[PDB]
């Protein structure tokens, strides 16, 4: 399954939130 994943920096607080989160995570299936 390939699930795609994107990370915005919230531009008022100046956090990475990558969505899904997960996929920044990582899972046992390394990217």
Do not use: L, W, Y
């Amino acid at each position: 399954n390939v699930v795609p994943c994107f990370c915005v920096e919230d531009e008022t607080s100046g956090a990475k939130t990558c969505i899904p989160d997960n996929c920044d995570a990582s899972r046992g299936t390394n990217p």
